[PDB]
Design a protein around this ligand. Structure first.
Ligand SMILES: Oc1ccc(/C=N/Nc2ccc(Cl)cc2)c(O)c1O
Ligand SMILES: Oc1ccc(/C=N/Nc2ccc(Cl)cc2)c(O)c1O
Ligand SMILES: [Mn+2]
Ligand SMILES: [Mn+2]
Length: 181
């Protein structure tokens, strides 16, 4: 039927804090949200997932993603100094105080195993744990260790589904999906 605006969708669907942080991430990349709207949506989604992952167990995780790059590195360095954790080469998304490791969060509509292998190939760090979510409910994680319980992860998955369903309902899903990578 009607074909909506992705910008409208993002602003109606995500929390304003998430939207603004997303805008900042894009601006930090010099990129224009009004042209790269699908990517804007992707950034909001990834942010929301990182935030949900953290809220699934308050104070277990330190959030790295969403901060200014400089500030993010200061947080990472302080964590490494306090815990003795090995400094990663790339900025990760979270730190798990319980399992004593950084976490990289991926969100994709590509096939999750391939996506996982790509992330793990890029990272090169034996320590950073990778957790990949797809919009279809599949997930993939380092050493089949999924960190959180089924309830929490299902909450994340459900949110992803809701996003996909509302996109599809506005006619936005095809473009969004095809726009990855
Ligand atoms: O889920 C994630 C996927 C990618 C990134 C970081 N990407 N960084 C990056 C991506 C593209 C260029 Cl050209 C330069 C740097 C990242 O920080 C994530 O949390
Ligand atoms: O030009 C670009 C547009 C989008 C992306 C990232 N897209 N990520 C994404 C895109 C679609 C789905 Cl369904 C899930 C995740 C991106 O990395 C780009 O460089
Ligand atoms: Mn990140
Ligand atoms: Mn990530």
């Amino acid at each position: 039927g009607p074909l909506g605006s992705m910008e409208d969708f993002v602003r109606q669907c995500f929390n304003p804090m998430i939207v603004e942080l997303a805008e900042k991430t894009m601006k930090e990349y010099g990129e224009d949200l009004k042209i790269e709207t699908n990517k804007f949506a992707a950034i909001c989604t990834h942010l929301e997932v990182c935030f949900m992952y953290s809220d699934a167990s308050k104070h277990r995780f330190e959030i790295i993603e969403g901060r200014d790059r400089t500030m993010a590195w200061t947080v990472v360095n302080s964590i490494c100094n306090t815990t003795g954790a090995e400094k990663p080469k790339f900025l990760p998304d979270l730190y798990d105080y319980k399992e004593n490791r950084f976490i990289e969060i991926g969100v994709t509509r590509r096939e999750v195993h391939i996506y996982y292998l790509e992330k793990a190939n890029k990272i090169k760090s034996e320590k950073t744990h990778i957790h990949i979510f797809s919009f279809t409910g599949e997930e993939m994680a380092t050493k089949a260790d999924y960190t959180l319980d089924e309830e929490s992860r299902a909450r994340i998955k459900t949110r992803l589904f809701t996003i996909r369903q509302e996109m599809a309902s506005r006619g936005l899903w095809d473009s969004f999906r095809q726009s990855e990578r």
